[PDB]
Design a protein around this ligand. Structure first.
Ligand SMILES: [Co+2]
Length: 214
C-alpha cells in the first residue's frame, strides 16, 4: 500500500488504513494517527534529529500539527526525541515508571500519566495503552486501537525476521512470556501487530516471540 519516504531513505511512512500509518526510521517502527484534532504518534524516533524530521514530514503531509506522542518504554530508541517534544509543546505520554526511568537515565521527563490501562481519545480516534508486565524492559507498554483491532507491540514483540531476542540487558526473560500471554488474553481478535522493529504482522508475531523465549 501507499509508502512515502523523505529525501534520503531515512524515514518512511506506510498506510495501514484511512487514518493509521506506520512510521519507520533508520530500523525502528511507530504509528502516526491522523485524527480530527491533530496528529498523534505512537513513539517518536531514535534521537532529536530524526524526531524533528519525522514531525516535519507528517505535519507537512497531513496538514495538521503533532499534538501528542505515546512513549512505549524509556530506552533511547524510544525516549531519544523527548527534548524536541517538550520544547515544541508536544504532550509526551508515558507510565510513571517510564518517566522514572527516563529521569534516572538523564532524559527530560515525559508526563507519567498512563496507568496500567488508560483510555485516551483524540478527536474521534480511540487509543488504549496497556502495561502487560515486564518483558523487553521493566516498563514496556503496548498500544491498542480498538476501532481497527491494531496492536502496537513495540519491543515486547519481535518480527518474523528476528531470530533471537536482541538486546536482553534490561529484559526479564521469564516474565516476558507471561506478559505476552496477558496481551493475548486482553486482545483476542487482532487484525495487525506492529513490532518494534521489522515488518507488520498479526497475532503470529506474539506466538513467534513466545517461541524465541523458550
Ligand atoms: Co528497547
Amino acid at each position: 500500500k501507499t509508502v512515502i519516504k523523505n529525501e534520503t531513505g531515512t524515514i518512511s511512512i506506510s498506510q495501514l488504513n484511512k487514518n493509521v500509518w506506520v512510521h519507520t526510521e533508520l530500523p525502528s517502527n511507530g504509528l502516526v494517527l491522523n485524527t480530527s484534532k491533530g496528529l498523534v504518534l505512537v513513539d517518536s524516533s531514535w534521537d532529536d534529529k530524526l524526531t524533528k524530521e519525522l514531525i516535519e514530514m507528517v505535519e507537512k503531509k497531513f496538514q495538521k500539527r503533532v499534538t501528542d506522542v505515546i512513549i512505549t518504554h524509556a530506552h533511547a530508541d524510544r525516549i531519544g526525541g523527548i527534548k524536541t517534544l517538550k520544547e515544541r509543546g508536544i504532550k509526551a505520554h508515558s507510565t510513571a515508571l517510564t518517566a522514572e526511568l527516563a529521569k534516572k537515565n538523564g532524559y527530560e521527563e515525559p508526563l507519567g500519566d498512563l496507568q496500567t490501562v488508560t483510555n485516551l481519545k483524540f478527536g474521534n480516534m480511540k487509543v488504549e495503552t496497556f502495561y502487560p508486565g515486564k518483558g523487553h524492559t521493566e516498563d514496556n507498554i503496548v498500544v491498542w486501537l480498538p476501532q481497527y483491532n491494531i496492536l502496537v507491540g513495540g519491543c515486547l514483540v519481535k518480527s518474523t525476521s528476528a531470530k533471537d531476542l536482541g538486546n536482553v540487558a534490561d529484559a526479564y526473560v521469564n516474565e516476558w512470556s507471561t506478559s505476552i500471554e496477558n496481551v493475548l488474553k486482553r486482545y483476542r481478535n487482532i487484525n495487525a501487530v506492529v513490532p518494534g522493529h521489522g515488518e507488520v504482522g498479526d497475532k503470529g508475531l506474539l506466538l513467534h516471540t513466545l517461541d524465541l523465549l523458550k
